[PDB]
Amino acid sequence: GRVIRNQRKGAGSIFTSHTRLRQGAAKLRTLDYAERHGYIRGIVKQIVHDSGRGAPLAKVVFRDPYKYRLREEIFIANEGVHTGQFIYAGKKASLNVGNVLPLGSVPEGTIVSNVEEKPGDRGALARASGNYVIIIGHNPDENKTRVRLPSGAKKVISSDARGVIGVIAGGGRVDKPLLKAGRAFHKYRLKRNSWPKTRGVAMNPVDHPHGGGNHQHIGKASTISRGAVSGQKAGLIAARRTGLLR
Amino acid sequence: AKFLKAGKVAVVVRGRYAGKKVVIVKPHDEGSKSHPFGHALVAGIERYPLKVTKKHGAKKVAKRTKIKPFIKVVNYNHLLPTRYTLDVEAFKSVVSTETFEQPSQREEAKKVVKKAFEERHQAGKNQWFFSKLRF
């Protein structure tokens, strides 16, 4: 047979990311003395649009502790920040939108975003627009914290893991019908070559497992085992249930 | 009451001197044939003396502490009046409208101002007025 279309994204030739207009990797600040023993203040210089992403970025400019200069970094902008805002970062900072605190330093029921999985990864969870995690509880001994991931999963992380207060800007984005194949063309030119999607039904027995036949139909179950093997996997993969919800 | 007076220190916020400190010597509150606005004659220092330290002896101290003054008519709107003060009675005669108009009289009138300021920087009265504003 042939090598199918999803097996063909691994070698990553024309499928790589379209990286040109991107302002940079949006991260939080390296974890250092000043931030874990106290706070350090920047100001947000301009909040700007990043290509390929859905949410704006902010550029806050800190002062390097050990050398005379400025250093400016790329934060995914929480909703409500504004240029000219002081952004405080560190253990002793205060609870306000945009300030990055450790999670142990905030009461339960606090709404933070761009939170870290492990301390010093410079952010992981809830970076898409409109997302947030809630802090639902603490474990002050063998220090952990109980947070609610934007999907609704409940994860338990370290209490030295930082996160920035508030909701990520760009909420409401998918409320608007996209309305034409052109606007979906301008969406994925800045992301990657995924589009448009030929139904595996509509291709030949070589192109796909769903291909062939004098009618268009799958012919065998569209749910595939998690223990399937490379290229067998197309369709709903290792689903526990299927079909419209009620 | 009127806090713009003969001793009142100010900051120069408009033009070539912006950021430098002065002292309001002869204010005209209202009126003049030219300058149809409230203005104040001032004197200030254009160069600030450099950091002097324990380690500098001999001739460096005299050549670090050199002051360069100026005298200028200025509009109130271009001044920040502040709470500080100077004892100005030294040069009250030497900084005047008559000093302007005959610009020779202006470089004759910096000397009596330049001398009064490098005095005060010895005997550290008015420590602040001699320190560079920074911005």
Partner: peptide
């Protein structure tokens, strides 16, 4: 004496770029 002033520099994080210290413990050998 009149002309010389007392600065003192405040290392309290948040201000005053840190002085040069002995990093001999931290260096990458």
């Amino acid at each position: 004496n009149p002309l010389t002033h007392s600065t003192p520099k405040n290392f309290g994080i948040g201000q005053a770029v840190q002085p040069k210290r002995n990093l001999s413990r931290y260096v990458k050998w």
